[PDB]
Amino acid sequence: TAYFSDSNGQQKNRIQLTNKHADVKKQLKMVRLGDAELYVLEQLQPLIQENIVNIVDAFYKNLDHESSLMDIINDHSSVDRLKQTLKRHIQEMFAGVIDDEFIEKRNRIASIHLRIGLLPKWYMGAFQELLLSMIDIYEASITNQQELLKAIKATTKILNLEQQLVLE
Amino acid sequence: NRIQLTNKHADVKKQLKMVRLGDAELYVLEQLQPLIQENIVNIVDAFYKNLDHESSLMDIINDHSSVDRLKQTLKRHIQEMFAGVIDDEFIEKRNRIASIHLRIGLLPKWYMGAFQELLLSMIDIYEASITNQQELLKAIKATTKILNLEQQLVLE
Numbered sequence A: 001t002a003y004f005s006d007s008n009g010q011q012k013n014r015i016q017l018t019n020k021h022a023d024v025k026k027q028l029k030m031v032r033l034g035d036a037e038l039y040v041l042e043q044l045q046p047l048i049q050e051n052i053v054n055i056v057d058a059f060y061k062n063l064d065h066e067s068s069l070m071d072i073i074n075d076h077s078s079v080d081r082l083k084q085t086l087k088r089h090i091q092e093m094f095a096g097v098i099d100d101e102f103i104e105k106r107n108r109i110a111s112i113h114l115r116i117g118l119l120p121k122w123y124m125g126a127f128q129e130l131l132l133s134m135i136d137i138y139e140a141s142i143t144n145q146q147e148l149l150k151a152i153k154a155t156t157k158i159l160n161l162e163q164q165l166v167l168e
Numbered sequence B: 001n002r003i004q005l006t007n008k009h010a011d012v013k014k015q016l017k018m019v020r021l022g023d024a025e026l027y028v029l030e031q032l033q034p035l036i037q038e039n040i041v042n043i044v045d046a047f048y049k050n051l052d053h054e055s056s057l058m059d060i061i062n063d064h065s066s067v068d069r070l071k072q073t074l075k076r077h078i079q080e081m082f083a084g085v086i087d088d089e090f091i092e093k094r095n096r097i098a099s100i101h102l103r104i105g106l107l108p109k110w111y112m113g114a115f116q117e118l119l120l121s122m123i124d125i126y127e128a129s130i131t132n133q134q135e136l137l138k139a140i141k142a143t144t145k146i147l148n149l150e151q152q153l154v155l156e
């Protein structure tokens, strides 16, 4: 059979932003992230949620490479409390809806990371773990070759936007 | 083997680990270079084609340069990315980029969203040139690491 569900219309109106975030609209289009794409992300969410624990375990384990990062973690919270908010943020990424409320949250996390002194270069590198981790979740849960790229493309898109918004 | 960084860039060596870019991934990039070149013009002519979703970008270019000059560079830079061996010069090359990108006035957000158009281009070429799913992914991941590394370099 097939994995995703080809449904025209069950995709429309997934992007809902107002003047306050005029640019973001151009950004969503510059990465080919539209109604079709977001609806793809929504069909992946269940799949991501079911493996989020691993996703987040691999995540902090990967930062355990750069001592400083782990120090910044401890100085402000903890691995256990951070994993918790991370399982959440990552969830929302596949919500399939992009609106003002979705941007502004990014702005907040962007501000929080700056204050605590997280260097931007260590931020991008964090995503390379997420994407790789998700690539494998897909390749394993999605057998049809073509749909695997479909899913991989959608995520790289949403992840690019994450980086765009965090360091805007 | 394919990494000849001196202690001048000890942090970059940590970044390589963290993005999982080692001899293996680089060897994969080297092998992908031939493909990147017979398609480098379409890749780059596309890159510039997508910059219209935002007039400003196009305007930054026609002032501090020209489309043909930029392509000349891009084509050159993108190819190098698949050399398969990052050393000290490679790293400084990126510093040059950063420096300029700031002077001209390119916001980190547009710069970032630019790579997407590029990533998709490479992904397209592969899906049409690589039949074995494995080799498909193997090529994809490598390209996502070297790409991410750039973003890190031009944004430290």
Ligand code: HEM
Pocket: A063, A069, A070, A072, A073, A076, A077, A082, A085, A086, A089, A108, A109, A112, A113, A116, A118, A122, A123, A124, A126, A127
């Ligand atoms: C690229 C993946 C990342 C994502 C998507 C992410 C996401 C988040 C989110 C959503 C919050 C909470 C915002 C809120 O409560 O309003 C947060 C907090 C935090 N993040 Fe990250 N983060 C990432 C990477 C990092 C890295 C690499 C570090 C490690 C240095 C880090 C350290 C922290 C810390 C310490 C806090 C909590 C600060 C406090 O309690 O005052 N984050 N992150």
Ligand code: HEM
Pocket: B051, B057, B058, B060, B061, B064, B065, B066, B069, B070, B073, B074, B077, B096, B097, B100, B101, B104, B106, B110, B111, B114, B115, B118
């Ligand atoms: C995929 C991301 C991009 C890459 C890989 C990239 C790469 C480069 C490189 C290698 C150079 C030459 C640096 C040197 O002189 O040593 C450069 C120059 C430049 N880039 Fe970027 N760039 C990117 C995106 C952008 C975007 C989106 C714009 C804005 C429309 C832009 C505008 C320019 C301009 C105006 C120059 C100056 C060239 C000159 O001085 O004549 N770049 N870029």
